[PDB]
Design a protein around this ligand. Structure first.
Ligand SMILES: *[C@@](C)(CO)[C@](*)(O)[C@H](Cc1ccccc1)NC(=O)[C@H](Cc1ccc(OC)cc1)NC(=O)[C@@H](C)NC(=O)CN1CCOCC1
Ligand SMILES: *[C@@](C)(CO)[C@](*)(O)[C@H](Cc1ccccc1)NC(=O)[C@H](Cc1ccc(OC)cc1)NC(=O)[C@@H](C)NC(=O)CN1CCOCC1
Ligand SMILES: [Mg+2]
Ligand SMILES: [Mg+2]
Ligand SMILES: [Mg+2]
Ligand SMILES: [Mg+2]
Ligand SMILES: [Mg+2]
Ligand SMILES: [Mg+2]
Lengths: 211, 222, 195, 226, 196, 233, 204, 196, 195
């Protein structure tokens, strides 16, 4: 995998690839690594597919009960914390999860990194997965707070592409999301095969590759 | 030391049409280099127009299917004979699988049927419950032999329209049941040639609004 | 986590803790505060294995805050340090021990004295004028042994701390991304925003 | 593999299947496991494929030179002795399990040889992953004073048992018959019971289907004159 | 494997079963474990078939060369050559050999050479996995200076029991008689020895 | 988790036109030691089922007791215990298969390979296999251990597929089984000459044959075999 | 750790009517990392073509070695080496390192200049020859290639049809393998003309 | 250890050596391996001394309680209690037990219970490390319905050989005779049995 | 050693190599030059296990200098790179292989072209426009893939290199103490003294 997310003036961008692997064999190339917790909350998946999916859906049910009991939408901080405490019970037992809880709450846009190791970190910019190291280069060099929604979506898309190209265990397609105060908005599935050539021509990048 | 797992070989294949779905699998059961059975059914009618196959370790596969069939039975009892939709069955199966996260069912599972709009549906599972809906999926021993062929002949991957030279893709025209069964038979015939655990026979289960139909075809017995 | 320092001066306790959080070959954050306020005049910094650190610190925090409410009274730094040590000494023989080392810095309002306690994951408690956990003390103790006086001002303690950090930044192979510094005195706890 | 050796009245016959494997994958569907050591001495090999070929070529080369030196036709016991001493020296690291058979001025002979260098004598033998399926047939139907035609049948029936019941064996049956006072007849693909059925569809593509970036002529010819 | 060699009035008799196993599979059920290294010096082989064959082949070479130069070798000399190989290559071998031979001067002699490479001259010897089950029987029933027929019955009964209890032993009972008269091969089938 | 101590080797079986045949030798091995020579490994359940068991004998005796208790329990408050509500081969098998899989799932298996052979109420042949892992399969021929490698190939020459079952008579099927047992005696180092054979026919019922022996064995050719290569004498 | 899957890559060869085709991907990696998209795995010695998969240092080394040996062959024999002969030379050269082998999967392709007969062959890393009539596969996506070749291939294809078949076999196999791709090349070989085509494929 | 139990005309006789070892050291040379679980039901113990003692003690408790409620238990019942312990605790035990007893109805009976916890009813049984060396002898010399004196000689000769070859066996030969007449203990010293 | 980078621009090759040398938990030096001049227009940077690195580099240096004297002629960067690769491919099957990864940057005076070769310890050679060894490329390749042009000036290459180094300094947990940068062009080899 490669997944990323970052806060900015107009909310939070969330991007991810779609490759699934079983050794060297590519099992799937159309997987959803973004999870729809609730209309104002997203979750990323990296590492164990089953683990990430199961615990985050469990989280989602936990969050909904919260809304019923408290007549109020859960905060991103509390949501990430429920997950963290849930997986912490099974620490050392073999769980493999690297996730990001992205949303907008009363404190504005929120972004938390949560893993099976026990870390729970608030941050403006994250990228997790085998290809994270490639994606960070593009993010760090182009990331600003005063980013337009159009430019921000491209940055997250371009960052995944960078990783999909180099990392053998990342690729397939790019899934984009934008989280506003009025909820999250899906910005489509983008095949890397077609996207790569497009970006190469329009941007001029990837000169070493022939097309 | 006691190894609670085994490998009974076999290979399965699910393809989803516009208003139908197929779930195929070979009928050979093996251990190491021996043949246990040349005809041991692996794909089952589970009720509510859902077919299922758990490929890998037969003892775990039989147990999972047996449990899901039971889950369907109790879904009727508890919810006024309501029909279990394919998307609801998939989610239920995730929970059957993850209930053993720390002693997994060593199987790759596929179910097929129709969605609530009447369109063909195939769902694929890993051994611990991660599932996703797909148009085309091969699982098991010869999955790596078959899937690239299906990417090419079902989703028309790396195929472009002549004259344009890579500028315009081949359009995604739907397949009929008769065209699909040809791809299934050619997939298993090709797999039988190059994989030693695949052969003997091929049993296909086709699902339509009318019900569940079967078709059987012989394969090479070497 | 990596480096946590502590120094008790005349009228305060200074805790310096690294800012970096690392998962493998990647620095996840460079502004992490490895500390929790246990009470208005008691601060605990911590370092160890991921998860264990924060889970333990917040568990301790909750217990001390509960005590404060129940009695309407702030526990002494010595009482808090003993409570923490017992929890760690209890932990070490459990099924899965907390892998956490801590420094407790507090100002005893009764005795009008600053106090610094060093406690490792085994439950090994020691009161010190200055202390460190992990590979930190190895570089810094020679400078502290040389320059430290018990009558130092807070400003003199900070300058000595800068010297200790400068040595770490020169000879440690790992980049810990600087430190967050906090001072505990009679007026409470505050953070040095420029270091 | 499945390989067998069967003695009869006036000679000896060996046979083998034609499958080679890389784990569960079939690398070659029509492999040649019957090797020639000398014109009238043939061996069938199981185990590490390269080793059975290499060890057979080597001993066959040295047998030919020996035959020329001595002005005599090579004996099976010579090939046997040369093989086992070679294999023994490499302590089983050369994974060659062979059935050696032939005719010479002494008569007709049939031996088996294992990778570590042990040899056995017999009227009927079987080696490979399908040796048990084959031996079951041989133990059921072998008898003393077999004819050439009965022996070929027994041998191929033994190989078939392996082809059908052993996953490490498959495809076709090769045979070599070595009769006294005659040329040895190598019957490549004596049986062909595993022909692939016709495919349901033709996957021949329209020309221009594949996207291309560059084209160029490759110069294979030497440097030209003028 | 079940092997034995027994001295008697007129000479010596070697005896053995015919089963060779690869685990629980019987690779050969009509094995000849009685091997000739000289006209009237034979050996019984146990342990690794590859090792014992390679050894016996080398010994046969040494004794053939000995004979060409110095005349007919003694049974003690043959046992010494076996020993020299088994002892010096003990780290790389798994061989349990019984040597038996007939001279006119020394008559029947039996030497056993277990795993380490030590040599032991005996009136009779037993070896192989199946020998364990007949230590008691053989000790109770062995006498010196038996007749040929008595000795054949002793070996037949002994190996019969070894085969009965040891799964690694079985098949036919082969025997080799070594006397001044010459060399006589014997064979006894299951239907004969099982009903004893 | 354990290791098997006293063990039983192959159990072989096949279907024929009117029923099923099953066979197994009478040996209880203790490693390479052929320890116990009078062990019955075919255990009848009623007059319509025979359970053949290989593997650990102590676990076999435990299973034998479960089956004996099953018959007793089925008779309780059951006026049709010897008629419509009698134990079927399919009932007996599924029970064992349930037990075997449960035991492997507790990491404490019954170290056996079992073949349940019988004839159902409607006259249908029943033949199914189950082992220590809980793995189950059915086939016209079934065999355990060495039988799988040597007997199945021979039995499959008689009944290669389902359509060959009606064409196979009881005399032909018994002949094939008896021949297979001889082959196993030639080649299995943990087998014995003495064996038991059971036929369950839909007309003639259950015939249980004890104290059978492997006969018509070929050994004469051994006299001609000399040395291991070059030896002539 | 596994030397045969560190660098990644694939090679496939096919026979046709009076022609042969051999193709390869262009990827060179360090496990997950892609390093080069220009690492061609196909070489030729006169009219004989050799594709090599596996450990890249051994691929490069064997090429230099067979160039060495074929150049000497030609000087002494006064003629170019033929595919049947070269195949034996490859086998010989590989088995001479039986207990310290080159971690490679070579594939020979060419047409005999005298008989005009198309020829392909494959080897294991120690020299065992697989002389196939239809096709040969090698690499990290060998299973994928077997599935594609076994279903797409039909005998006696014309050069321009064979091109499409082998290209599609390679492309779709490579797209189901993490360690193969980043470009592809196909050689179409006839008795006295050889065309080399670079394919357009997804770069992930 | 070398132990055996043999049925005969008038009842049954148990036999055993008296050697207990800790490696190559003989911790006890006058051990009593013949242990009583009921008036006329005894057992021979092999394997772990701690395990076999703990088992026999529990069995003796069960049979004492059985007798208080249901009267004198059968030898089969005694063997079942042994088995139930040996089988259900097979992962934590190393016990090889021979059970032998006399009824007036069933007369002499012998049950052997090897490592796994299986039960085998036999005319006679042998067990222990030294039993391996006398499988052949015992099979050849055992007859049914022997006299008391014949059976004593059979056990004496058998264990004599087991002791001769097995270093883990030795000391004196103890025997226990179980008949309608009562219970008779016997003992035979080295100077007697060694010269057989 | 840790990070070695290389970038081939229009008319030159730029090699950037880390300055730090580390033995366990201590930085021994912070100004180490991990490079050797093989010939006037050929430079080789290197990184791997201690000892092997310098021993190999100087062994190669001596061989090329010997060739230059014998023939009074400078070998092409391609010829040098092939010589080095063969030595490493020879080494990998030896009793104790050289654990060294190298970058060879040179200016071919015949073709008037800069050339960059990446060779790992196995003897895996590849010609590149830009390359890296170890965990370096993981962080830098995304930036190079984005910004690199073959018609870049030396000054533009250096700015792109600064960007690559800035990213390393942010996300790498290890402090490599900056880099020494060297440029290889038609006029020879020179060092950028301010970076
Ligand atoms: C990249 C691709 C791998 O680094 C990324 O982490 C993805 C994340 C992901 C998230 C949600 C769904 C799918 C994938 N991870 C994987 O692809 C993991 C990598 C992995 C392999 C093996 C593992 O065991 C230690 C752990 C992680 N793969 C899987 O989880 C794999 C075992 N499962 C699937 O691919 C599930 N699919 C396969 C096809 O059937 C449907 C489910
Ligand atoms: C049957 C198929 C056994 O499976 C038979 O013995 C054949 C014999 C044979 C003889 C001549 C030509 C072709 C085939 N053997 C094989 O097909 C072997 C199977 C095998 C694989 C790996 C082995 O090493 C443990 C031993 C046997 N195939 C091959 O040898 C061939 C495909 N090569 C390899 O798989 C590469 N080996 C090379 C050495 O290291 C391991 C992989
Ligand atoms: Mg929670
Ligand atoms: Mg990629
Ligand atoms: Mg087969
Ligand atoms: Mg401390
Ligand atoms: Mg026997
Ligand atoms: Mg003694």
């Amino acid at each position: 995998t490669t997944t990323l997310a970052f806060k900015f003036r107009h909310g939070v961008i969330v991007a991810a690839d779609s490759r699934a692997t079983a050794g060297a064999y590519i099992a799937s190339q159309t997987v959803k690594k973004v999870i729809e917790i609730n209309p104002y909350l997203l979750g990323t998946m990296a590492g164990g597919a089953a683990d990430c999916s199961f615990w985050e859906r469990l989280l989602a049910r936990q969050c909904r009960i919260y809304e019923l009991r408290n007549k109020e939408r859960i905060s991103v901080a509390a949501a990430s914390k429920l997950l963290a405490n849930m997986v912490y019970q099974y620490k050392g037992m073999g769980l493999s999860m690297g996730t990001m809880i992205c949303g907008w709450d009363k404190r504005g846009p929120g972004l938390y990194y949560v893993d099976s190791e026990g870390n729970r970190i608030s941050g403006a910019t994250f990228s997790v997965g085998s290809g994270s190291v490639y994606a960070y280069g593009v993010l760090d060099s182009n990331y600003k707070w005063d980013l337009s929604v159009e430019d921000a979506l491209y940055l997250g898309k371009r960052s995944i592409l960078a990783a999909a190209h180099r990392d053998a265990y990342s690729g397939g397609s790019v899934n984009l999301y934008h989280v506003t105060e009025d909820g999250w908005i899906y910005h489509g599935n983008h095949d890397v095969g077609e996207l790569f050539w497009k970006v190469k021509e329009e941007e001029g990048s990837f000169n070493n590759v022939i097309g | 030391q006691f190894n609670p797992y085994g490998d009974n070989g076999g290979t399965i294949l699910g393809i989803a049409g516009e208003d139908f779905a197929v779930l195929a699998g070979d009928t050979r059961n093996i251990t190491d280099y021996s043949i246990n059975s040349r005809y041991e059914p692996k794909v089952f009618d589970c009720g509510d127009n859902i077919v299922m196959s758990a490929n890998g370790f037969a003892a775990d596969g039989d147990a999972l299917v047996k449990r899901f069939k039971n889950s369907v039975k109790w879904y009727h009892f508890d919810h006024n004979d309501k029909k279990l939709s394919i998307n609801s069955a998939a989610r239920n199966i995730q929970h059957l699988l993850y209930s053993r996260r720390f002693f997994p069912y060593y199987v790759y599972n596929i179910i097929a049927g129709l969605d609530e709009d009447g369109k063909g549906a195939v769902y694929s599972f890993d051994p611990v419950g991660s599932y996703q809906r797909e148009q085309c999926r091969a699982g098991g021993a010869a999955a790596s032999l078959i899937m690239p062929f299906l990417d090419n002949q079902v989703n028309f991957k790396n195929q472009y329209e002549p004259g344009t030279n890579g500028k315009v893709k081949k359009p995604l025209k739907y397949l009929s049941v008769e065209e699909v069964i040809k791809l299934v038979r050619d997939s298993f015939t090709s797999a039988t040639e190059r994989h030693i655990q695949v052969g003997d026979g091929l049993e296909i289960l086709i699902v339509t609004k009318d019900g569940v139909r079967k078709e059987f075809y012989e394969l090479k017995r070497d | 986590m990596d480096i946590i320092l502590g120094i008790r001066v005349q009228d305060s306790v200074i805790l310096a803790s690294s800012k970096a959080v690392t998962r493998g070959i990647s620095v996840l954050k460079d502004s992490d505060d490895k500390t929790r306020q246990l009470s208005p005049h008691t601060l605990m910094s911590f370092a160890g294995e991921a998860g264990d650190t924060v889970q333990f610190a917040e568990y301790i925090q909750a217990n001390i805050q509960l005590y404060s409410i129940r009695e309407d009274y702030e526990l002494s730094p010595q009482a808090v340090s003993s409570f923490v040590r017992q929890e760690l000494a209890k932990s070490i023989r459990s099924r899965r021990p907390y892998q956490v080392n801590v420094l407790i810095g507090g100002y005893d309002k009764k005795k009008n004295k600053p106090e610094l306690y060093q406690i490792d994951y085994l439950g090994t408690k020691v009161e010190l004028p200055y202390g460190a956990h992990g590979y930190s003390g190895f570089y810094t103790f020679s400078l502290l042994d040389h320059h430290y006086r018990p009558d130092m001002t807070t400003e003199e303690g900070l300058d000595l701390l800068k010297l200790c950090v400068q040595e770490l930044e020169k000879r440690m192979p790992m980049d810990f991304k600087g430190v967050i510094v906090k001072i505990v005195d009679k007026d409470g706890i505050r953070q040095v925003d420029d270091f | 593999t499945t390989i067998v050796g069967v003695k009869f009245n006036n000679g000896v016959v060996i046979a083998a299947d034609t499958r080679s494997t890389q784990g569960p994958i079939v690398a070659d569907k029509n492999c040649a496991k019957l090797h020639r050591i000398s014109p009238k001495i043939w061996c069938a090999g199981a185990g590490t494929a390269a080793d059975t070929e290499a060890v057979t070529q080597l001993i066959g080369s040295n047998i030919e030179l020996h035959s020329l030196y001595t002005s005599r036709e090579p004996r099976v016991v010579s090939a046997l002795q040369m093989l086992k001493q070679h294999l023994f020296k490499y302590q089983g690291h050369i994974g060659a399990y062979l059935i050696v058979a032939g005719v010479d001025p002494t008569g007709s002979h049939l031996f088996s040889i294992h990778a570590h260098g042990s040899t056995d004598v017999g009227y009927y033998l079987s080696l490979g992953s399908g040796s048990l399926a084959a031996m079951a047939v041989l133990e059921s139907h072998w008898k003393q004073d077999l004819t050439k035609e009965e022996a070929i049948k027994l041998a191929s029936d033994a190989i078939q048992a392996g082809i059908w019941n052993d996953l490490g064996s498959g495809s076709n049956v090769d045979v070599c018959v070595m009769e006294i006072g005659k040329d040895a007849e190598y019957l490549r693909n004596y049986l062909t019971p595993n022909v692939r059925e016709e495919k349901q569809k033709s996957y021949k593509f329209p020309r221009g289907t594949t996207a291309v970036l560059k084209e160029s002529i490759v110069n294979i010819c030497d440097i030209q004159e003028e | 494997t079940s092997i034995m060699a027994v001295t008697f009035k007129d000479g010596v008799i070697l005896g053995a079963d015919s089963r060779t196993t690869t685990g629980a599979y019987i690779a050969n059920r009509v094995t000849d474990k009685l091997t000739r290294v000289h006209d009237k010096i034979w050996c019984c082989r146990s342990g690794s078939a590859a090792d014992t064959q390679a050894i016996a082949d080398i010994v046969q070479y040494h004794l053939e060369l000995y004979t060409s130069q110095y005349g007919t070798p003694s049974t003690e000399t043959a046992a010494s050559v076996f020993k020299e190989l088994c002892y010096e290559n003990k780290d790389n071998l798994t061989a349990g050999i019984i040597v038996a031979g007939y001279d006119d001067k020394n008559k029947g002699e039996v030497y056993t050479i277990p795993l380490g490479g030590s040599v032991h001259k005996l009136p009779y010897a037993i070896a192989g996995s199946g020998s364990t089950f007949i230590y008691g029987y053989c000790d109770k029933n062995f006498r010196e200076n038996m007749s040929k027929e008595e000795t054949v019955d002793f070996i037949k009964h002994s190996l019969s029991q070894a085969i009965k209890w040891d799964g690694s032993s079985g098949g036919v009972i082969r025997m080799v008689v070594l006397t001044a008269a010459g060399v006589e091969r014997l064979i006894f089938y299951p239907d004969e020895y099982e009903q004893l | 988790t354990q290791q098997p101590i006293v063990t039983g080797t192959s159990v072989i079986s096949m279907k024929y036109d009117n029923g099923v045949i099953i066979a197994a030798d009478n040996l209880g091995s203790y490693g390479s030691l052929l320890r116990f020579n009078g062990v019955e490994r075919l255990i009848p359940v009623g007059d319509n089922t025979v359970v053949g068991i290989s593997g650990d004998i102590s676990d076999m005796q435990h299973i034998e007791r479960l089956l004996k208790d099953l018959v007793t329990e089925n008779a309780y408050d059951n006026p049709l215990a010897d008629a419509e509500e009698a134990l079927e081969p399919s009932y007996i098998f599924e029970y064992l298969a349930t037990v075997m899989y449960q035991r492997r799932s507790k990491m404490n298996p019954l170290w056996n390979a079992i073949i349940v052979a019988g004839v159902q109420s409607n006259g249908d042949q029943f033949l199914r296999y189950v082992n220590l892992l809980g793995v189950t399969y059915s086939s016209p021929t079934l065999a355990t251990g060495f039988g799988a490698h040597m007997a199945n190939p021979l039995l499959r020459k008689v009944v290669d597929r389902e359509s060959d079952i009606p064409k196979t008579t009881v005399q032909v099927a018994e002949e094939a089984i008896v021949n297979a047992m001889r082959v196993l005696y030639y080649r299995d180092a943990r087998s014995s000459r003495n064996f038991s054979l059971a036929i369950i026919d839909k007309n003639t019922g259950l015939t249980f044959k004890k104290n059978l022996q492997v006969e018509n064995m070929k050994w004469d050719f051994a006299k001609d075999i000399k040395g291991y290569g070059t030896q002539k004498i | 750790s596994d030397p045969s899957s560190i660098n990644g890559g694939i090679v496939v060869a096919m026979t046709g009517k009076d022609c042969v085709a051999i193709a390869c991907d262009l990827r060179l990696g360090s496990q997950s990392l892609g390093v080069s998209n220009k690492f061609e795995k196909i070489f030729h010695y006169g009219h004989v073509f050799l594709g090599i998969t596996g450990l890249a240092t051994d691929v490069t080394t064997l090429n230099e070695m067979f160039r060495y040996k074929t150049n000497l062959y030609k000087l002494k024999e006064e003629r170019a080496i033929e595919p049947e002969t070269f195949t034996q030379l490859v086998s010989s050269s590989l088995y001479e390192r039986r207990f310290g082998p080159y971690f490679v999967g070579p594939v020979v392709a060419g047409i005999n200049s005298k008989s005009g007969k198309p020829f392909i062959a494959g080897f294991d890393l120690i020299g065992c020859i697989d002389e196939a009539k239809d096709f040969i596969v090698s690499g990290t996506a060998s299973d994928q290639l077997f599935g594609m070749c076994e279903s797409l291939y039909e005998p006696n294809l014309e050069p321009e049809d064979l091109f499409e078949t082998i290209s599609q076999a390679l492309l779709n196999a490579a797209d189901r393998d993490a360690l193969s791709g980043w470009g592809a090349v196909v050689y179409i070989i006839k008795k006295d003309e050889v065309v080399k085509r670079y394919l357009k494929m997804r770069q992930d």
